[PDB]
Amino acid sequence: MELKNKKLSLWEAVSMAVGVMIGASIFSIFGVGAKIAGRNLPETFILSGIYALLVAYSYTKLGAKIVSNAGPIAFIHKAIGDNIITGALSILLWMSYVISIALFAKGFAGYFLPLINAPINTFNIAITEIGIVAFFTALNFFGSKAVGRAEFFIVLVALLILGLFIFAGLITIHPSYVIPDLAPSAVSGMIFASAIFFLSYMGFGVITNASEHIENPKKNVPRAIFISILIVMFVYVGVAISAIGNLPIDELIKASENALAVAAKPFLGNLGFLLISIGALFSISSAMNATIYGGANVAYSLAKDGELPEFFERKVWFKSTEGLYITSALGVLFALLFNMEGVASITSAVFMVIYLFVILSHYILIDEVGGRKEIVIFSFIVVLGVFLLLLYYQWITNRFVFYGIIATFIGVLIFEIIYRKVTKRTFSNNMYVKS
């Protein structure tokens, strides 16, 4: 008997990564972008995309030769073998989805409360935060597959709303409000925000952890990554220009929960405000459905077992059911211990260390996968610099959030050495070799 997985086409994989990227930036941290970057936000999204494309250079080179549902972990193991670092990075990869759920949790509430006229409490937000995570945990048992089939349709609808937001957003604008502020008292904020908005291009995760469930992976994994980054880059900027141009920046800081919902009111009314708020929840729900069922489930099973099943359903929690509750538990927890700006900082920090190890892997395997050494040196220094800029900012901005970021990297390394002593779990070439 030979089983076969249901496999994704190029555009299915693109829609998947685009949906996750959009849900994490357009409807999640756009209100954070107003407070820090301000009018430099459209320039921020470009600069953020630059780092991503540098990361993509290593991913697309490694993903062209190495096929695995392990993703980065596969590449990393091929370079540095099995050890405590490889295992920490696997748990770190799982944690990247965990904290992502916290970011999607906050975003969902930001657009939901103003829709039904509810005050912005620490408690009234928290009710939605626990609730929405509980809804997607319960979805595992009846609806996870059905929502996953709708994801492609939802992404398009969410895109079409944004596609009308630009075409009809470039009408009653303030071209004197979109002019890039060149004064270094607000320029450094653009570069500091680009360290946070690195997460805006988190498409690497969902794609690489589904690489064995994608048609012609050696070809379509690189392409999906490359196409995904270039699409959202145009979407971010085109919406960023419109949002700043139609609304005063001080009104955007106080509407940090819903940045675009209030932005639609002046030039589309409450009917246009209704269309944004509805299409927001749908976009964040489908992004989370993708993160839990396709990413978190895969990341957890690999971190726990040391390998992955050859044949599994992507759109359910296919193995180790306790992992679903644990992932959901920390998903709510992070959305409580930290704020909208707090969650985003951690998420971006986790990803950068994964990418840094991906770049380091590309360096080591450059004989096998190919590439230009001097570009493989360049992006490494860039990402590290951006990673340091995020730590530098957080230390001089938020004490409470700064230590939360530091604790993560230690707590992951502690858990690894402990877990490796208890279970003796090893990682092997099983991840990418066959048969």
Partner: antibody, heavy 124, light 114 residues
Framework: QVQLLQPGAELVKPGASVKLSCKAS????????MYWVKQRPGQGLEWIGE????????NYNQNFKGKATLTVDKSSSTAFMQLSSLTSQDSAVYFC?????????????????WGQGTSVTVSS | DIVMTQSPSSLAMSVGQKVTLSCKSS????????????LAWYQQKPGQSPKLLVY???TRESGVPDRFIGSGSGTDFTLTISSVQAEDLSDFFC?????????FGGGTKLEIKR
């Protein structure tokens, strides 16, 4: 190409234990179930139990819940069945057999590849 | 626990004849969602391990001769050998692969008549 290596025969004294081995090659050991099957000479087949070699999860036939214990060695792709307190009623051929495992789904599968079997004699 | 019953225990058929092996289950083996019947057939020659012939009631296993056809539904199932060849003498077992305590039929022994 895909094969399961079991030793031919085993002689063991009554009341003692025996550990039977099933070495797997040609496929990824942890991606499939490992089942064990009992057959008495000239009679039918009994399913003893299943092990998931990835996490060593086990599920037993009620009639074997104290007689048989299933373990694996991931590193060497080998499955073991421990048989305890052996009587003459345990004199049989014991097969290991692979079964496909499609994880997050409603499909269960039969046994597509079998070992040659280990015939266990329990005698003084 | 599902009990599997095969009838008869043994039959004799001559080379070229059509053989019909019957197998019944205590419970329906049809899963009404994703609608397949979880029944397998095995062939066991003397001294050898069992060989999977058919799974999910109707699909032949890779490498199995055309002569072997599985059919049936719910609680009643058939294995048909369209035309028996001398080397087909063996013990045929059905097995449900529906729910965890997997169970076999007592087998049907096929001898070649001459």
């Amino acid at each position: 190409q895909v094969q399961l290596l079991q030793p031919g025969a085993e002689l063991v004294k009554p009341g003692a234990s025996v550990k039977l081995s099933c070495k797997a090659s040609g496929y990824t050991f942890t991606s499939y179930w490992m089942y064990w099957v009992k057959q008495r000479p000239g009679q039918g087949l009994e399913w003893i139990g299943e092990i998931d070699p990835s996490d060593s999860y086990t599920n037993y036939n009620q009639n074997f819940k104290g007689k048989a214990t299933l373990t694996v060695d991931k590193s060497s792709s080998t499955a073991f069945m421990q048989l305890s307190s052996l009587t003459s009623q345990d004199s049989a051929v014991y097969f290991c057999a692979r079964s496909p495992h499609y994880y997050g789904t409603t499909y269960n599968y039969p046994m597509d590849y079998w070992g040659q079997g280990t015939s266990v004699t329990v005698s003084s | 626990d599902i009990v599997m019953t095969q009838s008869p225990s043994s039959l004799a058929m001559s080379v070229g004849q059509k053989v019909t092996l019957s197998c019944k289950s205590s419970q329906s083996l049809l899963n009404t969602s994703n609608q397949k019947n979880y029944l397998a057939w095995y062939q066991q020659k003397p001294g050898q391990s069992p060989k999977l012939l058919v799974y999910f009631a109707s699909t032949r296993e890779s490498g199995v001769p055309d002569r072997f056809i599985g059919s049936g539904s719910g609680t009643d199932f058939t294995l048909t050998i369209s035309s028996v060849q001398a080397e087909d003498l063996s013990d045929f077992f059905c097995q449900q692969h529906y729910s965890t305590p997997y169970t076999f039929g007592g087998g049907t022994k096929l001898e070649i008549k001459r």
